[PDB]
Amino acid sequence: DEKRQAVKLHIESEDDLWLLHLILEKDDKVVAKTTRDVGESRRIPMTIILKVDYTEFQEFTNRLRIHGIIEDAPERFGIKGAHHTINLDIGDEIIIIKQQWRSRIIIALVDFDEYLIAIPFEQGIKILSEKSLRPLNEEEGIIEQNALEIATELAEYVKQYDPDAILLAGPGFFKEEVSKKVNAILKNKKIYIDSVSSATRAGLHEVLKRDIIDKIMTDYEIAIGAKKMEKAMELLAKQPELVTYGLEQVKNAIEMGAVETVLVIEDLLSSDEQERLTIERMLEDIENKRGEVILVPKESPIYFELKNLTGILAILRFRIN
Amino acid sequence: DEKRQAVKLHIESEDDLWLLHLILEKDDKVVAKTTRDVGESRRIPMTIILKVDYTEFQEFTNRLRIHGIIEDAPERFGIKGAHHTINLDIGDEIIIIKQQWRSRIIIALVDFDEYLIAIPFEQGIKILSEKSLRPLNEEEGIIEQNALEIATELAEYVKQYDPDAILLAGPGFFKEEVSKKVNAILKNKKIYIDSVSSATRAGLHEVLKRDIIDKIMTDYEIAIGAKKMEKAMELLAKQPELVTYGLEQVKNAIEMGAVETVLVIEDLLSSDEQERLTIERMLEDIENKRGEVILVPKESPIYFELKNLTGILAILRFRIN
């Protein structure tokens, strides 16, 4: 229902511009900031998803004009289907989606008059709910009431898909309101909060490319590798060697296809010449045999215990001596 | 003899990496820094032109490995035709040349044991001379003698193509030596100097993408627009109006197809809303009728005289009243 192969790009030079001009084809979509003069006239900044028609490099002002029709924008402007021109300059950002191209997160985009619910898969992006609230507000309960309607609307999706983390995002304050609600009905899940200028498919592609996703992913991996280490310690001191550490030991273990899961600290992957390539390969081999690889960052409450043991231990399937 | 449609890219994020991985095809060429262990083993940094085979994104070390054969490198290593892997990381630069894609400058790439001569056209890059000097050195005159052999070798090409500027580039000191010579035989041309790590086709693609080209281009435009302004002043005060300035005046002039050449200061093209688009269009119209457009930067000894007159004057073909 929504592609996942998108690329964010920061226009740093005039060549970044020619590149975009050369590879952006007919029916490709682009996500970027822009201005629209709706109404009399009122110039209002906004972020839209545009399906390209054709691009134009402007020699004199040194910028790229992407021509096309608006695929998505805040519904309150009713501008979908319209033609628009995106003026891309040095300094701007843009997410491109060409046609020819372990933590499950539940995403809720909430604006004060619209909202969207979706879940990202390695496959793609499925959009559960996505509707307006525009005709639903005229004094009374409004905000609190609307937030609740979304929180409820979310709780079903969570229980129904049991995601690892919940991402609450969107333009100012309202999202904090919805957080308050959804939180008031479970306290069983981790809720994250970040802000994007709108609650549309544009804000969605924007959120996925924001730093918050990494944070959610890294908290997950840090957590799984913490319990695993416990599984390692209690197992270590009680089997015994159904656990091993040290580079060489882990290689002979790979040889036998014994590695159930391997724990490796981030350092063993940062500038290590013929080693960073070697370890790198070891790690692909482990997965090429249904092995689990959990990288370990400085901040995990298990990083030091691990580093102590050379920085790489493998929980074994069977003894290797 | 050499493509001109190349794009320089600064790897700033992991997406810059996926992008490269997605658009780099089979027989495309890439120019980048790298290391080669030639010989026993000796790891030596170098810049080569690689014809791609296939790329690989490395999930764990987060980098792209471009696989292929070496199209060009310093001849002293005799490594052309070899297979090599380029390890591209966040922080690196790369110039891509895909297969599916007013100042004439003479370029001389000189290294202490090799050199290259070429001229860039809007059409492409023609490579005049390009040979080794390797077997030509064992005590005696050597440097001075070799420099002279290149200077001579260049003088013919210059007189034969009468280029606007001469670009002397390459790795340390030797280029300064050749400058001294070539200069000692003409003092009739503008010689520029910049440095690249090698004197190959790689160093060439590198030079073309370096700041020096802009400098050469801008000095040219500043010079042509200075004499033109003189042509404007003496013409202004003596025709009379075969010269006009001011935005509106220039538009009605375009209407008649009277603009021979237009002079416009850089400011009229920097953030001017519905104007920067308007002027921009005016300028394309002038060229869409064999008109000459000379942009004017702050530093030209004619910038202020121009700005005085609204910042835009047109030398006319005939009166427009």
What distance in Å separates the CA atoms of residue B175 and residue B170, rounded to the nearest whole number?
6
Chain A residue whose CA is closest to B87: A277
Q: Is A179 left (phi over 0), alpha (psi -120 to 50) or beta?
A: alpha
Task: Flag if B8 and A15 touch (Cβ within 8 Å).
Answer: yes
Q: Which amino acid is located at B271 in the chain?
A: S
CA-derived radius of gyration, chain A? 24
Residues A125 and A202 in one domain: yes
Say whether B18 and A7 touch across the interface (CB within 8 A).
Answer: yes
Using the beta-carbon criterion (under 8 Å), do B8 and A8 form an inter-chain contact? no
Question: Looking at the structure, do residues A296 and A282 belong to the same domain, yes or no?
Answer: yes
- Does A60 contact B280 at a Cβ distance shorter than 8 Å? yes
From chain B, the residues in CB contact with A58 under 8 A are 280
Angle at A51 between CA A48 and CA A53, to 5 degrees: 130
Q: Same domain for B127 and B37? A: no
Closest-CA residue in chain A for B211? A13
Q: Is A50 helix (H, G, I), strand (E, B) or coil?
A: strand
Q: Chain B partners of A98 at a C-beta cutoff of 8 Å?
A: 22
B-chain CB neighbours of A7 within 8 Å are 15, 18-19, 22
CA distance A40 to A137: 25
Interaxial angle between packed helices B273-287 and B247-256, expressed in degrees from 0 to 180 and rounded to the nearest 10: 30
Given an 8 Å threshold on Cβ–Cβ distance, is A60 in contact with B22? no
List, in order, residues 6 or more apart from A85 with CB less than 8 Å away.
Answer: A65, A66, A67
Q: What residues of A are in contact with residue B209 (Cβ under 8 Å)?
A: 15
Q: What is the resolution of this structure in A?
A: 2.6
What total number of domains does chain B contain?
3
Tell whether B49 and B80 lie within a shared domain.
yes
Compute the residue count for chain B: 321
Closest by Cβ to B15, choosing from A9, A283, A284: A9
Find the largest Cα–Cα distance for chain B.
81
DSSP A181-245: HHHTTT--SEEEEE--S-SSHHHHHHHHTSHHHHHHHHHHHHHHHHHHHHHHHHHHTTS-SSEEE
CATH number of residue B145's parent domain: 3.30.420.60
CA distances (Å), B67 to each of A274, B22, B55, B71, B203, in order? 17, 14, 6, 12, 21
SS3 (DSSP) at B145: helix
Taking contacts as CB-CB distances below 8 angstroms, the residues of chain B near A276 are 61
**Exposed, middle or buried by CB within 10 Å (0-12, 13-18, 19+), for B294?**
buried
Cα distances from A265 to residues A226, A229, A253, A284, A313, in angstroms, run 12, 12, 18, 16, 10
Find the CATH number of the domain harbouring A80: 2.30.30.870
| Whether A22 and B15 lie within 8 Å, measured CB to CB | no
C-beta separation of B295 from A60 below 8 A: yes
Which residues in chain A are closer than 8 Å to B60, comparing Cβ atoms? Answer: 269, 280, 283-284, 293, 295
The last residue of a domain, from among A172, A195, A219: A219
Contact A19 B10 (CB under 8 A): no
Domain co-membership, A107 together with A96: no
- CA-to-CA distance for B35 and B261, rounded, in angstroms? 50
Under 8 Å CB pairs connecting chains A and B tally to 52
Report how this structure was experimentally obtained: X-ray
Question: Are B280 and A15 within 8 A, CB to CB?
Answer: no
What lies within 8 Å, CB to CB, of A195 at 6+ separation is A169, A170, A171, A172, A175
Residue from A18, A28, A61 to probe the interface with B (highest B Cβ count within 10 Å)? A61
Together in a domain, A87 and A191: no
Name the helix (H) or strand (E) containing A16.
Answer: helix A14-23
The answer to whether B10 contacts A9, with C-beta atoms less than 8 Å apart, is: no
Domain boundary among B49, B81, B101: B101
Which of B219, B242, B263 terminates a domain? The answer is B219
In terms of domains, do A130 and A80 share one?
A: no
Minimal-distance CA residue of chain B relative to A269: B61
CATH number at residue B299: 3.30.1330.30
Structural domain range at position A246: 220-321
Instruction: Clarify whether residues B203 and B249 are in a common domain.
Output: no
Same domain? B186 vs B117: yes
Report H helices in chain B: 14-23, 142-161, 174-183, 201-208, 211-236, 247-256, 273-287, 303-308
List the single residue in B23, B269, B276 with the smallest CB-CB distance to A23. B23
Distance between CA atoms of A320 and A308, rounded to whole angstroms? 22
Measured CA to CA, the distance from residue B269 to residue A60 in angstroms comes to 7
Closest listed residue to residue A120, CA positions, set A23, A10, A246, A216: A216
Question: Between helices B142-161 and B174-183, what is the axis angle to 10°?
Answer: 50
State how far the Cα of B179 lies from the Cα of B192, in Å rounded to an integer. 9
Nearest chain A residue to B12 by CA: give it.
A10
Considering only CB atoms, B22 lies closest to which of A15, A101, A293, namely: A101
Shared domain for B165 and B185, answered yes or no, is yes
Looking at the structure, tell me whether residues A174 and A234 fall in a common domain. Answer: no
- Give, in degrees to the nearest 5, the angle at Cα B259 between B253 and B263: 105
Could you tell me if B92 and B144 lie in one domain?
Answer: no
Task: Kindly compute the dihedral angle of the four CA atoms of residues A205, A209, A211, A217, in this order, to the nearest 10 degrees.
Answer: 90
Q: Are A32 and A88 in contact (CB under 8 A)?
A: yes
Q: Does A15 sit within 8 Å of B209, measured CB to CB?
A: yes
Tell me the CB-side half-sphere exposure of residue B37, using CA atoms within 13 A.
5
- Helical ranges in A237-293 per DSSP H: 247-256, 273-287
